[PDB]
Design an enzyme around this catalytic site. Structure first.
Site, mmCIF file in Angstrom:
data_model
loop_
_atom_site.group_PDB
_atom_site.id
_atom_site.type_symbol
_atom_site.label_atom_id
_atom_site.label_comp_id
_atom_site.label_asym_id
_atom_site.label_seq_id
_atom_site.Cartn_x
_atom_site.Cartn_y
_atom_site.Cartn_z
ATOM 1 N N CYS A 1 51.230 35.215 28.037
ATOM 2 C CA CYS A 1 51.462 35.974 29.263
ATOM 3 C C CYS A 1 52.594 35.334 30.065
ATOM 4 O O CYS A 1 53.272 34.418 29.581
ATOM 5 C CB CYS A 1 50.211 36.043 30.127
ATOM 6 S SG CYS A 1 50.122 34.657 31.199
ATOM 7 N N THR B 1 52.699 33.189 32.524
ATOM 8 C CA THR B 1 52.648 31.754 32.670
ATOM 9 C C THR B 1 53.346 31.112 31.478
ATOM 10 O O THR B 1 54.243 30.285 31.653
ATOM 11 C CB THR B 1 51.197 31.285 32.765
ATOM 12 O OG1 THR B 1 50.614 31.834 33.964
ATOM 13 C CG2 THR B 1 51.118 29.763 32.806
ATOM 14 N N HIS C 1 46.533 29.637 27.021
ATOM 15 C CA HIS C 1 45.318 29.683 27.812
ATOM 16 C C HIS C 1 44.513 30.982 27.633
ATOM 17 O O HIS C 1 43.484 31.158 28.270
ATOM 18 C CB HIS C 1 45.660 29.508 29.274
ATOM 19 C CG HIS C 1 46.527 30.591 29.802
ATOM 20 N ND1 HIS C 1 47.876 30.657 29.536
ATOM 21 C CD2 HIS C 1 46.232 31.690 30.529
ATOM 22 C CE1 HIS C 1 48.377 31.752 30.077
ATOM 23 N NE2 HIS C 1 47.398 32.395 30.683
ATOM 24 N N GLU C 2 45.003 31.893 26.801
ATOM 25 C CA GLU C 2 44.306 33.151 26.520
ATOM 26 C C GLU C 2 43.906 33.129 25.044
ATOM 27 O O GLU C 2 44.728 33.440 24.186
ATOM 28 C CB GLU C 2 45.227 34.344 26.710
ATOM 29 C CG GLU C 2 45.914 34.467 28.047
ATOM 30 C CD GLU C 2 46.609 35.813 28.162
ATOM 31 O OE1 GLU C 2 46.811 36.459 27.104
ATOM 32 O OE2 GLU C 2 46.961 36.229 29.284
ATOM 33 N N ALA D 1 42.636 35.274 42.955
ATOM 34 C CA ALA D 1 43.048 34.177 42.081
ATOM 35 C C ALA D 1 42.016 33.943 40.989
ATOM 36 O O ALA D 1 40.837 33.864 41.268
ATOM 37 C CB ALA D 1 43.226 32.902 42.894
ATOM 38 N N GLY D 2 42.458 33.824 39.746
ATOM 39 C CA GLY D 2 41.527 33.578 38.656
ATOM 40 C C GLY D 2 40.435 34.626 38.469
ATOM 41 O O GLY D 2 40.636 35.818 38.721
ATOM 42 N N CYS E 1 34.049 24.694 45.279
ATOM 43 C CA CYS E 1 32.993 24.705 44.275
ATOM 44 C C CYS E 1 31.620 24.767 44.936
ATOM 45 O O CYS E 1 30.690 25.397 44.430
ATOM 46 C CB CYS E 1 33.066 23.458 43.387
ATOM 47 S SG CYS E 1 34.286 23.540 42.025
ATOM 48 N N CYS F 1 38.941 26.312 43.092
ATOM 49 C CA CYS F 1 38.564 24.911 43.161
ATOM 50 C C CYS F 1 39.828 24.102 43.511
ATOM 51 O O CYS F 1 40.905 24.298 42.930
ATOM 52 C CB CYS F 1 37.990 24.485 41.799
ATOM 53 S SG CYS F 1 37.979 22.720 41.451
ATOM 54 N N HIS G 1 56.912 31.228 31.667
ATOM 55 C CA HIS G 1 57.524 30.326 32.634
ATOM 56 C C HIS G 1 57.775 29.029 31.903
ATOM 57 O O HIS G 1 58.866 28.481 31.950
ATOM 58 C CB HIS G 1 56.602 30.053 33.830
ATOM 59 C CG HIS G 1 56.563 31.169 34.828
ATOM 60 N ND1 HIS G 1 57.688 31.880 35.189
ATOM 61 C CD2 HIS G 1 55.536 31.696 35.538
ATOM 62 C CE1 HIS G 1 57.353 32.803 36.076
ATOM 63 N NE2 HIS G 1 56.052 32.713 36.304
ATOM 64 N N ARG H 1 56.278 50.855 30.429
ATOM 65 C CA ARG H 1 55.001 50.385 30.950
ATOM 66 C C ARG H 1 54.218 51.534 31.562
ATOM 67 O O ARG H 1 53.029 51.670 31.323
ATOM 68 C CB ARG H 1 55.224 49.292 31.999
ATOM 69 C CG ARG H 1 56.337 48.311 31.647
ATOM 70 C CD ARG H 1 56.016 46.871 32.057
ATOM 71 N NE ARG H 1 55.267 46.209 30.982
ATOM 72 C CZ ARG H 1 55.337 44.899 30.730
ATOM 73 N NH1 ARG H 1 56.124 44.125 31.490
ATOM 74 N NH2 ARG H 1 54.644 44.357 29.721
HETATM 75 ZN ZN ZN Z 1 47.663 34.558 31.016
HETATM 76 ZN ZN ZN Z 2 36.158 22.067 42.687
#
Ligand code: ZN
Ligand code: ZN
Ligand code: ZN
Ligand code: ZN
Ligand code: ZN
Ligand code: ZN
Ligand code: ZN
Ligand code: ZN
Lengths: 343, 343, 343, 343
Positions: free
Chosen positions: C38, C40, C63-64, C287-288, C99, C107, C43, C201
């Site tokens: 992706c 990231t 990371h995927e 985020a996340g 957390c 976090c 980059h 797209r």
């Molecule tokens: Zn990703």
């Molecule tokens: Zn944490």
């Protein structure tokens, strides 16, 4: 060490001497400085129906307590030796759907300190490292010992839409109900009504409530209509008494919320249609403390001084004199009794 | 009847005599007992850009007032002659996406009392019956006069997750921010931090905050860190000051909430990703009073005594001495100034 | 084993051979079956500004991904050898305020697989046991590999008030935006508008959106007014393009919600007053993935068939040919590209 | 003008001729194009207890109808002559705790169309202008006629935490429960389970549910277990059947939500502690349609096509053949029956 235990399937408890438990991986050893007693402990003591289906002797009881971390097990990064801590009584599994959802307070495999395994009515107790909540060193252990029951009040009060700027009716002036009275008052509830048939308990709620009611001398529904003009927006139920439950629900205005912590001793007759569905009421079943937001909210209130629990500490007794302690509780002649395991 | 009006496209206001208006259908005639002034009125006073593109003389100003229901229009059944009331300044259209959705506080067709039509800086004023909030006869009119601006604070504090049992940072100790401080304190927030460069404004919050901060003299962040251990859970922004906005967001813990009532005079430079997105912050744009909910929460706080607004009323002047009221405003000195239209 | 790594502070990546990592306490060894790429990763590849401040070579990226638990460390009760799993890229500390609050997705000490430590663009990777989400054995690894980015869409869509029965505007048809398009359509959003300047797209969003817009050929604000009659109730922003952000916010109706996942490359000029505060808008920084509710909602949708991700898998290439892979991505000629570490 | 009315205190209805009514201020005159019937109408039909203590003959029944704005009262500006509309049956007082709080669906002074005053089982009907919901001219009147009962389903599904990405159990496959099934399916719930003993009703849900269950033939709990792995996250109760209520609550995971629209004919035996409190369940009493929000969500689903209500209309009969419509009802056979007042 000294410890109060239930050694057989019968009434009473026994003072015994046992070796100091040892903390293994993920656990910590806690030196108990103060512990309290509540209804659960009274069930065990009287060895009633409840206790019989849940308790499995031998058991060192006590689930409301605080102390100092005296030792930690291999690899425990936190808390740390010397820390002052309060303990969450529920030990969660982290491997069920409730835990997955974040609803730790109702974990399918919940184990409770002082109920399913040895608790705090002893000089020492081993608990999961994750169950320890570190308090400021200047927080008196006595107050730290009652943060667990306090959490119950906190959970009930802040569930749903909360209580800020809303009329509230609390049915039941038992200890947690008195605690909830302190919390709704410090939260901006108004008007606040507390109802309970026992004079000794009502009185404790006078500095917080705006109106005290003895359902057995005044028509609760009518006092409420005169205090608010109709009904309350929130009902916090802590007694489990069925007539109070019905009265309380009748006291809510349409669209209101009832948050229920009280556990009735027997099923009730419930007019689903009339008391809930047709008036758009939402009933919240409150169990335990939300893992961590309940503790965050409650300790925030206590640490900052928004609430002061001190007046609830009606008695202090060495563990040796546990019998007088349970006696006081059982007779309604006390709110929060503290037991000292060092004596 | 005496009234204070913007008669031409220029600065200042003019004391005038008008015949007492008559309420048509759906309207009531209020005999004003007390009015207040805020920044908006100031904009109209100095006739700036804002006022320029919005006001259409001749216009009796004032949107913060309380009074008595002198008479009602034909067929109006609520409120009633003799009722003491406060006014919601926003007159909503009930015919837009905002009203349908129940977001009346942001009706695209909002008509404001005292800006788009005659207001309360007069002995009598005609207003929509639905905009009147009936108050207990024993509430001072002076306090009743500031329930509108108090609602702004209430709306900001109870937006999102509220503030009970939470750490709060309030930037801006002007009148509204100060009312916010009173509310968050009465709602159980803790620790409560209030930051503002003006030591005059800041001292009004001493009895409500846990920590006062002059950001020009102390590092706000370092202070927030020392008081909470990291950040605050809630940011309540009332100043519209860009520097305070950036600093406040930084003081918020990740996942926290920023509720913004403050209107910056110009666009700000905003690092969307760093100040909002990456930290999981939610920012609430607060405008007006949620119609009826904000009034219910706020008046409950007032009626029950959870908050006492008396300390905020620094001056009460006759309407005819308005020149001085608008001066106190533009200067800083006072918190809330009351104007008595009967003199 | 084979692995794709960034061996120095420069452009490109390198295929290398490294020993198989080993799982210690609390960890598991995962045999990677599929991994995706992706922004990231792009980059890192281009070694741009972003990458330079975050990456510290040597680093095996990725990371995927999904694979099979090949080994677990001492004491790891779950998952289990043989389980099929997807991986959460964020490794949380469990010892910060976020957390504590349950806001694991932000976090303070977040560490990311494939960014801060060795990731999935390798035959083997060691990850924390708690980061593994077990999928049904029949879920194709290819789809399992993209549940991480899918989660981002899910999080954005269900944040705030959700999208069921509401008008929605999605700005940005990148991969996560296409995924969010699939989710809002399967969630009952309507009308649904997707806007993006790249034809390739937009097209991918045709089976889900109700109206496709190329902001560079039609006036987005006007198409929206004609599709809904005014504005949308929800804005899901995935591009980070500043003009789209402003356009999109102007597209919301007063009282609406903007949920922002998009990361702009530079601070933007923001009219706090006009775009947020005065129109009562609420902006959500996404985020996340919320730890566990985002995964629960998203996998529920995929397992049951409410959504079908398959059409997003535009390419499949052995890891050996990673260069062609990044090339396709970089050129906008692909949506989700799968890399196979076994070849 | 033809109308169907309850003329005396007895069973049945009588086809009558009345002059076309005239709309006064704030009212409109609807030329009804389609009406529907439900259990309430049945209660009035058989003149049971409920009807007995509520209906006051002479009364034109019917509360589920759609039509055209034939003419408006003096000064009415919305809707307009020529507008196609559906009607909200609840006429709210705007002068009670429920309305102030925005809980109009439970106004203590609710006046229902077709029960407390003339309804739509007639060629023309006069109603409050605020109760009219304008529909796109191209929506069939037949479908528009059932938007009211559809709103009940919508309200139940979107109450609490909604259903997107969640496991859902629906007990009761009657008309509303069936509409609920269509909605939860279009809202992304999964797995979706629907339980009802009647195989006729159950088959209508086959295209929407993931699992159909006849609880008299299979163990509902064991099936829920096999489909989810434990329990469902949401319980949507439409039957009012005590056994189904108890079983459904048991199928809910701890911390889940039960939203109840179903009205049991008698009080139930309820183990408050075991079914609600100890499991942290929240029960939502659903009544009516949230005023305007429920209509917005529901009509968006319909207008955009997320749900297609056509399959629910089994019969369309002339108003004059009402004897048979009420028979189909009381019998089961049909889902929703349409009545054409023009014949
Ligand atoms: Zn990703
Ligand atoms: Zn944490
Ligand atoms: Zn206890
Ligand atoms: Zn568990
Ligand atoms: Zn003002
Ligand atoms: Zn409006
Ligand atoms: Zn009906
Ligand atoms: Zn009402």
């Amino acid at each position: 060490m000294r410890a109060l235990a239930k050694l057989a399937p019968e009434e009473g408890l026994t003072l015994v001497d046992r070796p100091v438990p040892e903390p293994g991986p993920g656990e910590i050893l806690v030196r108990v400085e103060a512990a309290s007693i509540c209804g659960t402990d009274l069930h065990i003591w009287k060895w009633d129906a409840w206790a019989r289906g849940r308790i499995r002797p031998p058991l060192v009881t006590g689930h409301e307590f605080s102390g100092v971390v005296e030792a930690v097990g291999p690899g425990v990064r936190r808390p740390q030796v010397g820390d002052h801590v309060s303990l969450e009584s529920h030990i969660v599994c982290h491997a069920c759907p409730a835990c997955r959802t974040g609803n730790y307070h109702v974990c399918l495999n919940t184990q409770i300190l002082g109920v399913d395994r040895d608790g705090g009515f002893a000089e020492y107790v081993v608990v999961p490292a994750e169950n320890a909540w570190v308090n400021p060193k200047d927080l008196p252990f006595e107050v730290a010992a009652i943060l667990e029951p306090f959490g119950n009040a906190v959970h009930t009060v802040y569930a749903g839409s909360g209580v800020s700027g809303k009329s509230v009716l609390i049915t039941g002036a038992g200890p947690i109900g008195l605690m909830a009275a302190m919390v709704v008052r410090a939260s901006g509830a108004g008007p606040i009504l507390v109802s309970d048939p026992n004079p000794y308990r009502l009185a404790f709620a006078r500095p917080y409530a705006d109106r005290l009611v003895n359902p057995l001398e005044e028509d609760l529904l009518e006092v409420v209509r005169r205090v608010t003009g109709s009904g309350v927006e929130v009902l916090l139920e802590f007694s489990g008494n069925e007539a109070a439950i019905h009265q309380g629900l009748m006291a809510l205005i349409p669209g209101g919320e009832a948050r229920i912590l009280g556990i009735p001793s027997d099923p009730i007759r419930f007019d689903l249609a009339g008391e809930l569905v047709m008036r758009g009421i939402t009933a919240f079943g409150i169990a335990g403390r939300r893992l961590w937001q309940t503790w965050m909210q409650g300790t925030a209130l206590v640490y900052s001084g928004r609430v002061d629990l001190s007046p609830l500490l009606t008695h202090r007794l060495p563990l040796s004199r546990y019998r007088e302690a349970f006696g006081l509780l059982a007779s309604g002649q006390a709110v929060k009794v503290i037991l000292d395991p060092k004596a």
